[PDB]
């Protein structure tokens with residue numbers, strides 16, 4: 052992020068990305084610049100039922116019949132093979148279409164990320180005739196080894212933000 | 226382009242993209258912002274022998290055996306079907322690796338773009354911790370109808386600059 056971007060995001064970081072952090076947990080914040088309109092980036096990332104369309108490592112994701120996307124709905128993720136996780140059950144914790152804030156929590160499954168909770172926010176930037184997006188994503192998770200959990204989780208979040216960027220930029224081509 | 230980008234490119238436009246324009250010709254300048262390092266964009270676009278790797282509409286492109294990329298070498302392009310051209314023979318007019326300037330001329334083939342000549346230049350931008358590229362491409366061509374030639378040529382150049390952008394940005398992903 053540029054100094055101006057960090058300066059303009061300080062409010063959103065305090066509002067949506069601040070945690071009460073204890074030694075038993077680890078947590079981080081990551082950012083991704085996306086050269087696409089924020090309303091487009093948001094339309095992609097808000098689909099709690101289809102994380103495989105903007106994330107890596109998902110073999111399948113199922114939701115219940117007559118699914119309704121609202122707080123408390125869940126998704127059943129099966130991870131691709133060869134990762135430190137097999138399955139994950141996840142709950143939509145907040146969906147704020149007006150402020151472009153969403154977040155989820157892991158509530159079950161076979162994996163090593165107990166009490167994982169994540170928040171994603173999408174931000175509009177405008178300067179001269181330029182319009183672009185920054186996405187912020189933060190998480191908190193139990194810390195079982197200590198540096199490995201953070202290293203693994205950070206790399207996944209970064210790779211997934213990058214995939215979101217490629218999808219939105221593909222859609223935004225004139 | 227932003228006002229600052231246009232301001233910083235004014236020199237390069239005067240240096241490399243100015244033409245003596247007569248009513249029998251048409252000409253235009255187009256720009257493409259690319260979110261990748263300029264040395265990467267340049268390594269792609271300087272390959273006179275492989276335009277199909279950064280342009281649309283090319284069925285095949287052949288160069289002679291023991292090809293040497295230097296001024297006066299040629300390429301034999303076959304266009305995909307359904308366009309107002311079948312074949313084109315093109316000559317490398319200038320290759321300046323130090324200044325990132327290259328240009329070519331059409332010297333034969335079955336098409337409607339007689340005396341087409343093009344110049345492409347690649348420009349480094351740097352602000353705070355951001356590094357990005359702008360590519361400028363200009364052409365001059367005979368004007369046979371008058372608005373159609375410009376409309377066709379402009380749309381092709383714009384689409385090809387966009388393809389170059391997608392290729393370089395794919396390569397630049399962290």
Ligand SMILES: CCc1cc(NS(=O)(=O)Cc2ccc(C)cc2)cc(C)c1C#N
Nearest residue numbers: 102106108128130135136139162204207
């Ligand atoms: C393979 C990463 C992953 C994805 C996953 N589901 S998800 O991609 O739909 C949402 C997500 C959860 C946890 C992380 C670190 C990234 C993304 C669930 C788990 C338990 C893991 C692990 N390990």
Ligand SMILES: CCc1cc(NS(=O)(=O)Cc2ccc(C)cc2)cc(C)c1C#N
Nearest residue numbers: 276280282302304309310313336378381
């Ligand atoms: C199909 C566009 C095209 C490409 C082409 N060869 S090329 O793509 O390798 C370089 C090029 C030439 C002319 C234009 C307008 C764009 C690119 C030659 C011709 C005569 C045409 C036409 N019409």
